[PDB]
Amino acid sequence: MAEHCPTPHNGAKYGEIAETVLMAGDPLRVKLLADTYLTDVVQYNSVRGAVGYTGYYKGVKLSVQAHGMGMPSIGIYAYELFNFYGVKRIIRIGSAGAFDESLKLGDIVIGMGACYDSNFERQYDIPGKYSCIADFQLCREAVDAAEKLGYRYKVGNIYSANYFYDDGDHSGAWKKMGVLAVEMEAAALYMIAARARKQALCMLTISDLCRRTKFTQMMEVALSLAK
Amino acid sequence: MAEHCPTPHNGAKYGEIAETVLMAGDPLRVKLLADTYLTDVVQYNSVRGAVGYTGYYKGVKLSVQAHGMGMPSIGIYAYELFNFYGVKRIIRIGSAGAFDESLKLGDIVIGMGACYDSNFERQYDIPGKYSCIADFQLCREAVDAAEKLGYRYKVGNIYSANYFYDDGDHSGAWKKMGVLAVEMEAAALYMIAARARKQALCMLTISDLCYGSGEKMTKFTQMMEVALSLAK
Amino acid sequence: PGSMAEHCPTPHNGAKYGEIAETVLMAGDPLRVKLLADTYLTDVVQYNSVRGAVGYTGYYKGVKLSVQAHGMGMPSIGIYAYELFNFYGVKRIIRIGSAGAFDESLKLGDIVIGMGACYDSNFERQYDIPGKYSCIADFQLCREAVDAAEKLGYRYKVGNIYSANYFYDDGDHSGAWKKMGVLAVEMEAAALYMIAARARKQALCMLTISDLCYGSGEKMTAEERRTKFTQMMEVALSLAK
Amino acid sequence: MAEHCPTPHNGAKYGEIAETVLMAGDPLRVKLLADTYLTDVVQYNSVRGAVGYTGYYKGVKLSVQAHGMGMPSIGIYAYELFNFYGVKRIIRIGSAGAFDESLKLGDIVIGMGACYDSNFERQYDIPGKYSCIADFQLCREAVDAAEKLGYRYKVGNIYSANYFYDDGDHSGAWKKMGVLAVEMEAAALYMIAARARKQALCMLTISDLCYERRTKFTQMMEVALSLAK
Amino acid sequence: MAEHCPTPHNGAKYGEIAETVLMAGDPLRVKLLADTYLTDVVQYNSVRGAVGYTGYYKGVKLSVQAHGMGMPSIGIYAYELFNFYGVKRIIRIGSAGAFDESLKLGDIVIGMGACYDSNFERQYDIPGKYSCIADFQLCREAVDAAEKLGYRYKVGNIYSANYFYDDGDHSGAWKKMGVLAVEMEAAALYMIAARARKQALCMLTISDLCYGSGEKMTAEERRTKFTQMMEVALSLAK
Amino acid sequence: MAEHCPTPHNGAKYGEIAETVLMAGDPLRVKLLADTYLTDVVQYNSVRGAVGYTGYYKGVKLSVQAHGMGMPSIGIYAYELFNFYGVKRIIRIGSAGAFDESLKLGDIVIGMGACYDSNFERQYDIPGKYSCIADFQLCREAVDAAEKLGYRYKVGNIYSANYFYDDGDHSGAWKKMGVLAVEMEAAALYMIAARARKQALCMLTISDLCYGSGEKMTAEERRTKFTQMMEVALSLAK
Ligand SMILES: Nc1ncnc2c1ncn2[C@@H]1O[C@H](CO)[C@@H](O)[C@H]1O
Ligand SMILES: Nc1ncnc2c1ncn2[C@@H]1O[C@H](CO)[C@@H](O)[C@H]1O
Ligand SMILES: Nc1ncnc2c1ncn2[C@@H]1O[C@H](CO)[C@@H](O)[C@H]1O
Ligand SMILES: Nc1ncnc2c1ncn2[C@@H]1O[C@H](CO)[C@@H](O)[C@H]1O
Ligand SMILES: Nc1ncnc2c1ncn2[C@@H]1O[C@H](CO)[C@@H](O)[C@H]1O
Ligand SMILES: Nc1ncnc2c1ncn2[C@@H]1O[C@H](CO)[C@@H](O)[C@H]1O
Secondary structure, three states, rough: OOHHHEEOOOOOOOOOOOOEEEEEHHHHHHHHHHHHHEEEEEEEEEEEHHHEHHHHHHEEEEEEOOOOOOOHHHHHHHHHHHHHOOOOOEEEEEEEEOOOOOOOOOEEEEEEEEEEEOOOOOOOOOEOOOOOOOOHHHHHHHEEEEEEEEOOOOEEEEEEEEOOOOOOOOOOHHHOOOOEEOOOOOOHHHHHHHOOOOEEEEEEEEEEEOOOHHHHHHHHHHHOOOO | HHOOOOOOOOOOOOOOOOOOEEEEHHHHHHHHHHHHHHHEEEEOOOHOOOOEEEEEEEEEEEEEEEEOOOOOHHHHHHHHHHHHHOOOEEEEEEEEOOOOOOOOOOOOEEEEEEEEEEOOOHHOOOEEEEEEEEOHHHHHOOOOOOOOOOOOOEEEEEEEOOOOOOOOOOOOHHHHOOOOEEEOHHHHHHHHHHOOOOOEEEEEEHHHHHHOOOOOOOOOHHHHHHHHHOOO | OOOHHHHHHHOOOOOOOOOOOOOOEEEEEHHHHHHHHHOEEEEEEEOOOOHOOOOOEEEEOEEEEEEEEEEOOOHHHHHHHHHHHEEOOEEEEEEEEEEEEEEOOOOOOEEEEEEEEOOOOOHHHHHHHOOOOOOOOOOHHHHHHHHHHOOOOOEEEEEEEEEEEOOOOOOOHHHHHOOOOOOEEOOHHHHHHHHHHHHOOOEEEEEEEEOOOOOOOOOOHHHHHHHHHHHHHHHHHHOOO | HHOOOOEEEOOHHHHHHHOOOEEEOHHHHHHHHHHHOOEEEEEEEOOOOOOEEEEOOOEEEEEEOOOOOHHHHHHHHHHHHOOOOOOOEEEEEEEEEEEOOOOOOOEEEEEEEEOOOOOOOOOOOOOOOOOOOOOOOHHHHHHHHHHHHOOOOEEEEEEEEOOOOOOOOOHHHHHHHOHHHHHHHOOHHHHHHHHHHEEEEEEEEEEEEEOOHHHHHHHOOOOOOHOOO | HHHHHEOOOOOOOOOOOOOEEEOOOOOOHHHHHHHOOOEEEEEEEEEHOOOEEEEEOOOEEEEEEOOOOOOHHHHHHHHHHHHOOOEEEEEEEEEEEOOOOOOOOOOOEEEEEEEEEOOOOOOOOOOHHHOOOOHHHHHHHHHHHHHHHHEEEEEEEEEOOOOOOOOOOOOOHHHHHOEEEEEHHHHHHHHHHHOOOOOOEEEEEEEEEOOOOOOOOOHHHHHEEEHHHHHHOOOOOO | HHOOEEOOOEEOOOOOOOOOOEOOOOHHHHHHHHHOOOOEEEEEOOOHHOEEEEEEEEEEEEEEEOOOOHHHHHHHHHHHHHHHOOOOOOEEEEEEEEOOOOOOOEEEEEEEEEEOOOOOOOOHHOOOOEEEEEEHHHHHHHHHHHOOOOOOOOEEEEEEOOOOOOOOOOOOHHHOOOOOEEEHHHHHHHHHHHHOOOEEEEEEEEEEEOOOOEEEEOOOHHHOOOOOHHHHHHHHOO
């Protein structure tokens, strides 16, 4: 929908963002990704400091975009990318707290599914519980890539919380259910992708137990998904 | 584990059920699968007519077991299989109604995730919404096997309903969300397997259309062949 | 209303329209259903073997009735009961089953008449009910069942039962039901009651206590199961019309 | 527990209230009941105008008491009566709106079950849906009494609403489910009676259709009075 | 809407109720307020014993009306008043238990917001959580009057419970959230006022402490110590 | 708690943030606020580009900080500020869409309460419905400032949504309940402040009318027509 670009949150015109977007929470990290991996970089967004860049990675056009923190924030960005900019694929990368005791610091978690605190699923009027899943194909390509590069990974359920600071201790039930790791965004992305018939995947590096070399390895898995 | 066998629902003693169980709702279908694909068949269960057989498929030990209809029913059998009988993987095959308009009668759906009506999940005291997912490895192998056999398949989200007959029309929101198909069991299986740290996957054949003409079937062997290729 | 010949046979029932009588007794276990038909019915015809959910139609003291397996859990009984009331013209369904005792005055073999059924989620959402729906039995069946147990001199209680969606619980979610005076736990009644209410038809669940959910947790042997469900079946059979 | 009587809502000392209580929402109707049917009447409560009287009906000691409107109101009174005053049976009588289209003004509805909006349940920590039911024996006796007098009645499900005025129209699903009539109190009474192991029943006269007034209420009162032991 | 008066719960004809209504739960207390503070008193209601009177307070027509106990009861009366009788302003007065440990017996609590157990928000078809609030202007005038007269008060969140008798102990989480006091009515009044675009406020005198040793007002203090709250409420008469 | 600063979201050490913090979603707006109104400005945070500055307004030390978009984002910042940095009051300022049809572009809305979609009430284990309210004293001060300066304002309920794009139309019931305006942050701030026993207020400038013909502020108006709100907000610094 070219008529809806630029948006209140994104200064890009239609066509300035690639069909594959890598997203991360921190704009400083998004900039480091652009500087490290992309050639011919142009910035298409600086609205609200949520920097977005478009460049080339091994000859294919690729965009990297900041999404801020929490499901409502990434929801706004992903909705616009999928529905207004013609984006096909969003891969979110970031750090996470491990719930699963067998995960080591720097292990890659591939988020096949995302559990969640209520966000904006109510706005879809779903008469039961909706299970947020990644796109099977991105998930399969991310696993094949980790296996090809011989990196340590686990694929399974993550948890997209609305809180960073817990007023209680609410982690026990998720741990008992086999959830691998906690972050704050994936479930919103998966829902929006599913509604749009587009592909999303969240990949995470474990950084806390509930770095540059480890994180770089997560990047090589993610970047291998660029199309 | 062994001390809990036999159970109120399963006459098998510990060890009489293989590490891989293939499950279907209908005991007549389970019997067929046993008669068609397994050799040296022993029936380990007849409790409540929920038949269970152990035999060899291509010389590899395998069990096949009826689970009845609905999440509470499959919950009982899968909880017992995973927690008392030492079962490592359950592959469920079944029929489903299509929500996605590109699915035709006889297409196969691989349930990567399962949406659900509230069942027994309250028992887990979960402070949010739990997303039910299949075992990824099973998922991938099922896709590869379907591809190699040349079957029409889709992999994605399915919906485990508590009803076969809808008092209204509640399929709309699920359809908007991209959910592929409706059955009555998968979410319970997936939850129980995740808690047990075991593997589960649900595969389905579209037997009725929940859109358009609503055409229904009066042709399940292709799905059995994908399922059988997962046995270990 | 209640009769739709063109929807018979269904995906779950091989019966043609008219092969099922106006009163159906239902139990979870197809072996109990067969036993009941073998013990009590004459002129018996099997009208269903679909999914092993055996169903028979026969006569008891000159009255035609059907007996049918319904499998385990609310979604399962919900399928069969919906079809029976909406497609097969059934007027009355009496569920007979086994149950775990919550009320400590109940002994093994005691009969519980489910005037009401508490429940974990079943069909309520699909009916779009904007509050809490209380699942109750048909008063007339309830009253007949109590009168029969009373005339036959059986130990019974009439009150609330609980239709659970689980058999296993890693913890203990039973305390609050006991406090509320719930008598017994099973897994089906509430869905039956809701489906019958929707259809304006009659339903009742009766139970025999086969396990105690208190104390040392005594349970019936297989022999006691075979022989101590007689009293309930007989009460149930006298409700057929 | 005599130690808890009188209460903040009830001036009665332990023993001033009989083992059977008839309850209605309206204190004026409660006074009329005592004046009409009871002999040797003593008023045991006037706190908040929620009048309570004790007297004899055909030689049997009986109490009648106002409960006001809504589940939180009846819950306070019923809780005190069952847990503090040694009350064994409460029969509530009142008016209701019809949901079932075959009900005429003045029909009697016997509430075997009561559907509800939230009132009391959450405070009991119940991990599922609690079905609120009447005492079977009382329900049976009411049905026999109505049948014997040959009154038009139905016995089945009622709905205890938290509202008299509906902002939209939320009656449709209740009607589809066969719920007979709407009032505002029964389910709380039923829940509190079940928790206490005591007996309760709600009976109603249809006064409005949600789809001679005094004389209509009298038939119900006569059925109610039949149940007093 | 004159055509809806009298109602099943209120014998008044349209115009017999003033634009400002003071409400309390207890009819005995409503009668006392009328006799004490109003001149030219006419009783407009005695239906269900929920007495209502109209008179003058310092030259301004004012009505006082009983509302019974609980959100459904006050909901009926408030709905009628705002939607049929042309009422602009309802101030509820009453007693409450303290959750906040710095409140003493006799302190005034002004309910800027009301937490609640579900009573009848479902009937409004709200697709999230609705926060029940008082009218700011009334709230501001109550706080000013309390300060000007030097009364001990706190202004903040109250809790409208569905129960007087707790089967368990559910007070902990409210206390953690800073909720000041528990009563049984305010949230429904506030929701109905907001829907009608009218003004409502609940003020409370602490009559029991729901913390520590559970101190209660004596029967004598209950009879006596609601006068301060009255002068605050009466400041709001318009 | 000096030991918990800096945090993973904030590079400030304890004491680098004043006891009053004005927060807005957009770091470019926060920067503009610091440059236009504050003297002796020091930047204490650039973590995640969520800039924060501390400086002086009319002799009074204050901070201004970006909070990003949505309740979980503001929840992170506000939790840290109240619990680690010793902050006493946080005033959120922002733009909002009007639900109330008497509101014009540029009207100021003071959020006495905030309705909400789920944020982290679940995390507080509350056994009913919690009404999110502002601090009464900030609320009174804001209204007083707006009156003395003569600005057009309304005080009442706002709605903190979890969505900006509505997959349908869920606005009807909020409008019906008399909610004034929609934004995405206030309820979480209010809840956290209540738990912490600290003060919070959200004030909004109407930038879009979610009714009628749908008038929206010009890009020039969005850039420049927020000064009236900012002046009210600044007068709350102590
Ligand atoms: N333990 C954790 N809990 C919640 N979010 C986390 C955690 N660790 C990393 N994150 C991620 O970092 C950001 C919050 O610091 C969020 O946007 C989230 O994706
Ligand atoms: N449209 C449908 N809705 C629900 N379950 C279905 C449907 N079609 C097939 N099934 C499957 O068939 C069985 C019931 O006929 C169930 O156990 C369920 O798994
Ligand atoms: N203690 C119990 N808990 C749950 N279901 C029971 C129990 N006892 C008997 N049942 C009945 O038996 C089956 C499960 O064993 C169910 O269909 C249920 O109706
Ligand atoms: N249509 C109705 N809706 C709710 N309550 C009703 C209705 N008709 C009569 N009542 C009864 O009368 C009182 C409301 O006037 C309530 O106490 C309730 O028990
Ligand atoms: N602790 C309390 N809990 C509930 N209601 C109370 C409490 N203290 C006083 N009240 C008030 O007293 C009445 C019940 O006696 C209610 O209408 C309510 O407004
Ligand atoms: N109509 C609106 N809906 C949601 N958020 C809005 C609206 N207008 C302004 N906002 C604010 O602006 C941001 C969305 O761009 C949110 O952070 C929110 O606070």
